[PDB]
Amino acid sequence: MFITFEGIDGSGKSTQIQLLAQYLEKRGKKVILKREPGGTETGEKIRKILLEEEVTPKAELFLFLASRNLLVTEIKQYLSEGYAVLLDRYTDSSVAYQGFGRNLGKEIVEELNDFATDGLIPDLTFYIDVDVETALKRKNRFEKREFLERVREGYLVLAREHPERIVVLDGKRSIEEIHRDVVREVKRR
C-alpha cells in the first residue's frame, strides 16, 4: 500500500496525510509516514538547502531528485514488508513545480523521476485541488501566485494523464469532509 498526497502549498496535504495515518493505525495497519524533500538524514540536509537557499531551476530539480532517490531506497523495503507507506509529496511535485512551474518540461522531469525512483510508482495519489488565492490565504520561495497557478494547472494535466492512480479531491471542502473522501477511496484495498 503506497499512497501519496499532492497539491499546492496550503491545499491541506500535511493535515490530510496525518488524519489518514491515524485512521490506518487505529485499524491495525503498519503505517510509515514520510515527507519530501526530506525523509532521510541526508535528504533533510538537502531539504534545508532547497528551502533556505535560492537555486537555479535545474539544480533545484537535481536536489529534489537526490533527496527522492535516497527516500525511495528506504521505503521500498517497507513496502516489501506489508507496511503502508504514506508520502507527503512525491514525483508529481517535481513534475508540477519544476516541470510546469519552472517550465523545465513535463516529459523531461518525468523521465528524470523514473531514473530517480527506479520505477516505484504509487498505487494511489490524492491530488488536493484548490485555487491559489484560497491556498495562500490559509497557508517559502515557492509560494508566488503566478508560479503556483502554473503548478496547479500542471497538476490538473497530470490528473488527466494518470486517472487510474490520481484521485482529485475538492480542496474547498472542509478538513473533515475531505478526510471522508480520503477514507472512502482507500476502502477499495
Ligand X SMILES: Nc1ncnc2c1ncn2[C@@H]1O[C@H](COP(=O)(O)OP(=O)(O)O)[C@@H](O)[C@H]1O
Ligand Y SMILES: Cc1cn([C@H]2C[C@H](O)[C@@H](COP(=O)(O)OP(=O)(O)O)O2)c(=O)[nH]c1=O
Q: Which residues belong to the annotated binding site for ATP? A: 7-14
In the complex, the residues that contact Mg ion under the rule CB under 5 A are: 13-14
Q: What is the x/- site pattern for a copy of itself, positions 99-138, by CB under 8 A?
A: ---------x------xx----------------------
In degrees, rounded to 5, the angle at the alpha carbon of residue 78 between the alpha carbons of residues 76 and 83 is 130
Would you say 108 or 156 has its CB closer to a copy of itself? Answer: 108
Please give the C-alpha separations between residue 116 and each of 53, 84, 85, 119, in angstroms, as whole numbers: 22, 21, 18, 8
Question: Up-side HSE of residue 136: CA atoms within 13 Å toward CB?
Answer: 14
User: Is residue 93 a contact residue for ligand Y (CB under 6 A)?
Assistant: yes
* One of 1, 10, 84, 125 touching ligand X (CB under 6 A): 10
Q: What is the C-alpha radius of gyration for the chain, rounded to an integer number of angstroms?
A: 16
Please give the C-alpha separations between residue 133 and each of 94, 95, 158, 176, in angstroms, as whole numbers: 22, 21, 21, 21
Question: Cβ of 95: how many Cβ atoms within 10 Å?
Answer: 27
Would you say 56 or 140 has its CB closer to ligand X? Answer: 140
User: Is residue 11 a contact residue for ligand X (CB under 6 A)?
Assistant: yes
User: Is residue 139 a contact residue for ligand X (CB under 6 A)?
Assistant: yes
User: Is residue 101 a contact residue for ligand X (CB under 6 A)?
Assistant: no
Does the N-terminal peptide bond of residue 37 adopt cis geometry, omega within 30 degrees of 0? yes
Q: Which residues bind to ligand X, rule: CB under 6 A?
A: 7, 9-15, 138-139, 171, 173-175, 178
Q: Which residues bind to a copy of itself, rule: CB under 8 A?
A: 41-42, 45-46, 49, 53-56, 58-60, 62-63, 65-67, 69-70, 73, 108, 115-116
